[model samples]
Target: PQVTLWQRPLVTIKIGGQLKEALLDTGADDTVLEEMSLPGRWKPKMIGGIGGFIKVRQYDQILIEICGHKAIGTVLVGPTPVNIIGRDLLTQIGMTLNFPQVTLWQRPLVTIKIGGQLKEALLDTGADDTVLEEMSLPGRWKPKMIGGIGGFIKVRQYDQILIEICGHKAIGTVLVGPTPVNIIGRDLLTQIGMTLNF
Candidate 1:
């Protein structure tokens, strides 16, 4: 018998030739980095993750590169331990996950166009459905309520979500909820494909 070793493909971004390893999670709906793990400055906010809800004791700023691109972002941190490359990071380069192969590949960025205006959003695998901030909608968007766990979940009754990225239009059903902060979840991430970039 013979033993074999294998590794997953990790998208590389160049920042002065410094490289960072990220685990791409298909189960995750957001892009997140280890806040305290970074060597820069960041702001903290109360948020939720796999370990229920907790306050961000600290967050960190870092230049992340992937899909041959780069972006500066703030990652939240807490005493509990978990580092991930969630949806926030994926939106920058517009990539999708390839779960069966354990890879994430570059794709066109997700976007939306309304009244001839364009907006870019991220795709999050950690989230179960598409969600938008109430204010992101047009003309005083009043929303409805959808049943959710943990608390009352509000939703926008009628509207189709349109994302315009790189001049490409991806339209889908959108939901509005009382989100802690603005993040593009299942609204986009689910529309694409993904896997673990271990």
Candidate 2:
């Protein structure tokens, strides 16, 4: 696939719940899930995302299996632009991007498990947060409300859900509603050790 504005190896995290796909980003610095159906599944929390500071919270972690390895990580509930994985995952499993061959080194961080099915997802280093498509999300989710942009702003809300990846689970805050794309930011990327591949 052609490289995006961010970089190559677009990592997706099936969020719609039906084996969908999303891109993984490191610059996002946080995690983001879909919103449309976030109400009951995720709660709200007040936190900041790559897109700046916003009110978000934790909900539920999306399930994904990579290289026959299942991982559950925190997922922020929000109206996403495109699905993506971030550096947070890269730190756990070091990666090497083979742009010359259009191949990825190491194993994927997130995966899905349905009806004994398994698949691998790409891991992006440019994204700051993790974003998935609404169609890829799983069962019902209700996130917790953390807090809004700055102090207390009436911003759009998504089910701020949290998931576990690589045997490590963290809290993900939801982003505002209606965004063209979503991803992980630098704040989270620094947490992990990785480099940008061409």
Candidate 3:
């Protein structure tokens, strides 16, 4: 399945013979579902995120159909803000962030200036590096491959590039890749003093 910022990517998911519309959260690490009845035993589990931590039940080896793709993994059930299809199972289902494609809510896009070149990029927490689509840089670059839910892509890595995201400056490595959209990942995010805030 493809997940892009153009739309919310809320797809139909089937679990335990019930249907639900879940948010495809590329930024999340684990899948979280609302409280529900599940047969068999469940181990008490706890999950932590930006908003502290919460206790939940973990049911292992469960079948969840995500966007028509059948994925078997651990399911976390508890009181969650929303039903999230996280990176854990998203990769199991081979979901991709297809930006080559919007209206409910605005995406986390910001105007970033890279070496006097102004460009728009998505501040994606899911991404580990800053990737520019069809962009090239001077100096030394090494062959690097970055992997996401869908698969891996070849990229050129240029280190110590001056990047200004909404006036937040950071000198970091910027990856030039073939992605359809420009992405500002966690690498520069941390250097730029950016984090998930509620």
Candidate 4:
């Protein structure tokens, strides 16, 4: 579907027969909802993001309808900054990214593993460091100040942490804190053999 990224890309979606507005977040890998309860049995789980980490109930094969298209998959029900329609269902629903106001293109996104946990992160060339939102990490950390498009924010710096970018392995300083979104900035990007040819 044609969408705009200049502002938040949100759309009305139907979940559990309830109409709710959610973000079309390419930055996310799985669909996450703020609703704490849903139909059928669910498994307890946790998810981390800019605001930090949160506990969630994972419901499998949950059906969600987005912009009149129906898709079913595993959905996490919990308190989130906002409801998200992630790539898992986005691809299932077959929505193509476009641009040009009438067109919208998907941002660079990747699935990365941190401390053996899977997380999706945005490949932000503008950012100088990799930052995880509302994220909880193992090992000791020190408070640090990080500056970005939104200004400077305090973060917990974990040094020389191992991260798996797709199949590539790299260890770098990973910042954890509350941010608008999770980002794998230039520092870690180069470690994964990424080059901006453009």
TM-score of candidate 2 relative to the true fold? 0.38
RMSD of each: 10.7, 17.5, 13.2, 10.2
Question: Per-residue lDDT tens digits of candidate 1, residues 104-157?
Answer: 343223455543565554444444455655545543445665432123466664
Q: Return whichever of 1 and 4 wins on lDDT.
A: 4
Kindly report which residue stretches of model 4 are placed more than 4 angstroms away from their true locations once superposed.
98-107, 110-198
> Residue 12, candidate 4: how far off, in angstroms?
0.7
Tens digit per residue, CA lDDT, model 3, 1-198: 223333345779999999998877655668888898877789998776433467889999989998768988888998776778777786776554432211113355779988668899876655657788866466898998876433467888899999988767889889887766788876776666553311
Model 2 stretches with alpha carbons more than 4 Å out: 1-8, 36-41, 66-69, 96-124, 127-198
C-alpha local distance difference test of each model = 0.46, 0.40, 0.71, 0.71
Q: In model 3, what lDDT does residue 147 have?
A: 60
The list of candidate 1 runs beyond 4 A from truth reads: 1-111, 114-116, 136-152, 190-198
Worst 10 residues of 1 by lDDT: 1-10
Q: Which stretches of candidate 3 lie over 4 Å from their true place?
A: 1-3, 98-198
lDDT tens digits by residue: candidate 2, 85-196: 5444433334334222222333334442322334233343554344432333433444323221222222233353444333333445333322223333332223333345
lDDT of 4 by residue, 1-198 (tens): 444333455678888888899876555667888865578999999776553567888999887888878888999888775677777777776654421111114656678999878998786544567898776688899999865322467999999899997678989999988787779766776676553220
lDDT of 3 at 113: 86
* TM-score preference between candidates 3 and 4, better one: 4
1 or 2, greater by lDDT: 1
Sum up the clashes in candidate 2.
92
Q: Pick by TM-score: which candidate is best? A: 4
Candidate 4's displacement at residue 6, Å, is 1.8
